[PDB]
Amino acid sequence: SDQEKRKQISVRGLAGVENVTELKKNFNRHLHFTLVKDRNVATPRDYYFALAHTVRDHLVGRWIRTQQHYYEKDPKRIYYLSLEFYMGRTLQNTMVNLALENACDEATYQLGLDMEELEEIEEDAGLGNGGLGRLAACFLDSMATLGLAAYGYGIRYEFGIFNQKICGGWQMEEADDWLRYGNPWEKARPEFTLPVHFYGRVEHTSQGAKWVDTQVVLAMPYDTPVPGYRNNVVNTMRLWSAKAPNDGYIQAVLDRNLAENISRVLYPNDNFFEGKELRLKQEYFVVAATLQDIIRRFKSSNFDAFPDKVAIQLNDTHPSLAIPELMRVLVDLERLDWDKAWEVTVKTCAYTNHTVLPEALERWPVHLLETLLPRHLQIIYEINQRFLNRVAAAFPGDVDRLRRMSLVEEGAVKRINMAHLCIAGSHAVNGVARIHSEILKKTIFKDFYELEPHKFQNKTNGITPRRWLVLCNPGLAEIIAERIGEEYISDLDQLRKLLSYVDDEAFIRDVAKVKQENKLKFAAYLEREYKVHINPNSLFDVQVKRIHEYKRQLLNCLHVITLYNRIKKEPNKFVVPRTVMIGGKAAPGYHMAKMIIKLITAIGDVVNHDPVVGDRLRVIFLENYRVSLAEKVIPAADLSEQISTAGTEASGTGNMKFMLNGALTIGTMDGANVEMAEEAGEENFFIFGMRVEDVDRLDQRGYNAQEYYDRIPELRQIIEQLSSGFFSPKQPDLFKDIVNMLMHHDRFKVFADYEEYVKCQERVSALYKNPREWTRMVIRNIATSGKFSSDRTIAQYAREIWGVEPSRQRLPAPD
């Protein structure tokens, strides 16, 4: 067989040029050949798929080319391990990064179809809970845009974050069957399935330890392409799916599902640790399969050069088993000596911390680890012993420090502190905001910082400007481009140039206009899909994020109730109208969080139907908050609420989204809020409340909520209203749990920041009364948000942690 004949098999002239004529042809081809529909039975969903497939074709030509390029060039490869990847919709984002948006628009118009209507049909890819998952998605976009040889590795959950329904004011969870109609963006690779072992036992042979009598679960990869911004670079996100091996009969076949349950559903916990066996299996699963893939890719073009060609970033402690698993492979399978293996491991792994809340920290009981992963538990003990020996050498006689630094936590239930394991086996450990990274060195990891100061870094979070500006706010992106060009899209610092238009009356008018249109649009979307009338001329007060006590949605609730009581007291007095919007999902077993949602809706029940309040105050709970809803509500927001208790929000990222889209911020000196105020100037920020140091003082002396209740009349009245059943007539004591918590067991001191919060809210209302000055402060914000682009964050990881150089060099097009 002449092998020169197989040279015809090329992607050289396939998709055709990116003009309207070829696009319509392919749209048609896909509608008929791919979907087996005709113009008579086709529905809008079918038309949406035909378009997705048409765009996908252009995406694939570049995908194949990018991977060929990396094979030829062999760059250092970056592996981002995360159990979450909150991707959202992919159609629009693909059209924009490939510059096909226009042609697709024209091509769909000539066919008698409306592209915007089609885009709304796409299901959100919700394989994440919130901030942690979305950050991974932003980073993927940025790494592609910066031309890095990066791969995202995670789990392909069959069911992502649940869909939230509100019944009688309460949250109801519904499985998110996001694959029901299929996913055109993923490419299954059954041919690359790998084995993952569980349970079993350890045997010691003359030449080493052997992990035997193990149960096997296969890991099947699904690849999703991730396009960079107009540089023709398409990277890969590989998600693993669990499959049972082929080795009563009927029962035996039905029991296969048991093994496939590993990748069935995403744990809906945000910043909270649940030590369930299934979760541990998910963690080892993603890790074991990923590392095998990494080693084989490494051997296909000894291990001394491993750290030079491989960088493994651990997103939180979820994939922390990668450290002992890498040791297991190198020592048990590759037979390297312990010390060389360890050196390679530390040089390859880096760890990112995302929270300081103690209940969010993973501490796995050893009895669970010894039955499920016996060999890893042995390796962990060894790692521990050698690490503790170093400690003892650096701090002789300090037996207390040894106890505190141990990877093994004593107590009735022995547990492994995964955070300690990550610090010990990583060459770098980073926080996600300046204040958070400092807190890590000053508090929780102080002992580790003293032993190895060089390991601790900071990498302030960011968001991608493509999805969080160009995509969700085309109007804003339009008027900004009409003055400074399109170069900011991949270089956000250029937004700085906008400071020269702070005084231009044309610009001021435009910014205010884009926002009004965004608000008009959002108000329409609300009446259409959730029938209710909000006044588009009111101030849009928005707080959207996962429901959590530390995020203090309750502090927000206290404010709106204060506003209501005020109006009722002096009904004929003028107040700046407000539409307070709060949305977010609560973890299913988080009782307090679910009670907070009920409180929010109970408040709206009273406020929204009080005739004397009128159109002056509306409280709305946005149900099913997700990436696609964030893209709608954020560009329409005037005020962004970032009011977590100082020292609790590691960074936050939603705050940055609001800053980039023309909303002013009211928040505490927490996480990235500190750096945002720093960039825009504290005078262009609505800061309030305790600083981290004040919180420490209060803690030292003791928090007594009663003091505030006794000293603040307005607060007393609110609490009295809550306990009396004012907001729950048929059930007088429905909120007894919330009240009791605020009064006697509030770890986040809501009452302590109440007074400052309200006063601050008053200044917000004062400034909104003056349109031109409000819009001018907004411009001072948008103009200095450049530092919060994920491209900046990634550039820093690359250079300071991974040892690779970014690049905006575009690759050639398929043809």
Ligand X SMILES: O=C(N[C@@H](Cc1ccc(F)cc1)C(=O)N1CCC(O)CC1)c1cc2cc(Cl)ccc2[nH]1
**How open is the CA angle 669-670-676, to the nearest 5 degrees?**
75
Q: Is 228 in the site for ligand GLC (CB under 6 A)?
A: no
Q: Is 667 exposed, middle or buried (0-12, 13-18, 19+ CB in 10 A)?
A: buried
Catalytic: 165? no
Distance of alpha carbon 625 from alpha carbon 576, whole angstroms: 27
Return the DSSP state at 631: H
d(CA 535, CA 519): 10
Active site residue 759: no
Residue type, 477: A
* Interface with ligand PLP (CB under 6 A), residue from 435, 508, 593, 627: 627
The answer to whether 653 is a known catalytic residue is yes
Please choose, out of 107-115, 220-228, 643-651, 805-813, the segment that lies near ligand GLC by the rule CB under 6 A.
643-651
Indicate the SS3 state at residue 408: strand
Annotated catalytic residue 281: no
Q: Is 538 annotated as a binding residue?
A: no
**Known active-site residue 546:** yes
Residues 165-184 that bind ligand X (CB under 6 A): 182-184
635-664 positions binding ligand PLP, by CB under 6 A: 652-654, 657
Could you tell me the smallest distance in angstroms from the CB atom of residue 354 to ligand GLC?
4
> Applying CB under 6 A, does 185 fall inside the site for ligand X?
yes
Q: Which does 246 bind (CB under 5 to 8 A by kind): ligand GLC, a copy of itself, ligand X, none?
A: a copy of itself
135: contact with ligand GLC by CB under 6 A: yes
Residue 447: is it exposed, middle or buried by C-beta count within 10 angstroms (0-12/13-18/19+)? middle
Say whether residue 46 binds ligand GLC (CB under 6 A): no
> CA-CA distances (angstroms) from residue 141 to 150, 265, 507, 651, 794?
10, 25, 30, 20, 10
**Pairs from 729-734 (Cβ < 8 Å, separation ≥ 24):** 734/598, 734/602
Residue 71 annotated as binding site: yes
691 is in an annotated binding site: no
- Specify the residue, 177 or 213, whose C-beta has the smaller distance to ligand X: 177
425 or 584: CB nearest ligand PLP? 584
6's contact among ligand PLP, a copy of itself, ligand X, none, with CB below 5 to 8 A by partner kind, is a copy of itself
Q: Find the shortest distance in angstroms from Cβ 436 to ligand GLC.
A: 8
**Residue 56 or residue 618: which is nearer to a copy of itself going by CB?**
56
Strands 234-243 and 215-227: antiparallel
Q: Does 59 bind ligand X (CB under 6 A)?
A: yes
Q: Site for a copy of itself (CB under 8 A): which residue of 17, 19, 21, 33? A: 33
- Work out how close the CB of 443 gets to a copy of itself at its nearest, in angstroms, rounded to a whole number: 33
Name which of residues 258 to 317 contact ligand GLC (CB under 6 A).
271
Minimum distance from CB of 671 to ligand GLC (Å)? 6
| Residue sitting closest to ligand GLC (CB) | 131
**Residue 152 structure tokens:** 């995202």
Largest CA distance in the chain: 92
Question: What is the distance between the alpha carbons of residues 520 and 509, in angstroms, rounded to a whole number?
Answer: 16
Q: Of these, 168, 248, 453, 702, which contacts a copy of itself (CB under 8 A)?
A: 248
What backbone phi and psi angles, to 5 degrees, belong to 75?
Answer: -70, 175
Q: Is 33 buried (19+), middle (13-18) or exposed (0-12) by CB count in 10 A?
A: exposed
Q: CA-based Rg of the chain, rounded to a whole angstrom?
A: 27
Which residue is catalytic, options 545, 552, 598, 626? 545
Catalytic residue among 345, 352, 562, 653: 653
Site for ligand GLC in 330-359 (CB under 6 A): 354-355
490 annotated as ligand-binding: no
- Alpha-carbon distance of 450 to 432, in angstroms, equals 20
Q: In sequence order, what DSSP letters do the residues of 74-97 get, joined into one string?
A: ---EEEEE-S-EE----HHHHHHH
Per-residue binding letters, 48-77, with a copy of itself (x by CB under 8 A)? --------xx--xx-xx---x---------
- What x-and-dash track marks residues 665-694 binding ligand GLC by CB under 6 A? ------x-----------------------
Task: Give the Cα separation of 654 and 531 in Å (integer).
Answer: 26
771 binds ligand X (CB under 6 A): no
Q: Of the two residues 461 and 761, which places its CB atom closer to ligand GLC in the complex? A: 461
- Residue 184: DSSP 8-state: T
3-state secondary structure of 190: helix
Contact assessment for residue 801 and residue 428, using Cβ atoms and an 8 Å cutoff: yes
34 binding ligand X? (CB under 6 A): yes
Q: Which two tokens stand for residue 775?
A: 């819009």
36 binds ligand X (CB under 6 A): yes
The pair of structure tokens assigned to 219 is: 């890991």
Q: Please say if 545 is a catalytic residue.
A: yes
Would you name the residues annotated as active-site residues?
354, 545-546, 551, 653, 657
Q: Could you list the residues that contact ligand PLP (CB under 6 A)?
A: 130-131, 134, 545, 626-627, 630, 652-654, 657
**Which residues bind to ligand GLC, rule: CB under 6 A?**
130-132, 135, 271, 354-355, 432, 461, 649-653, 671
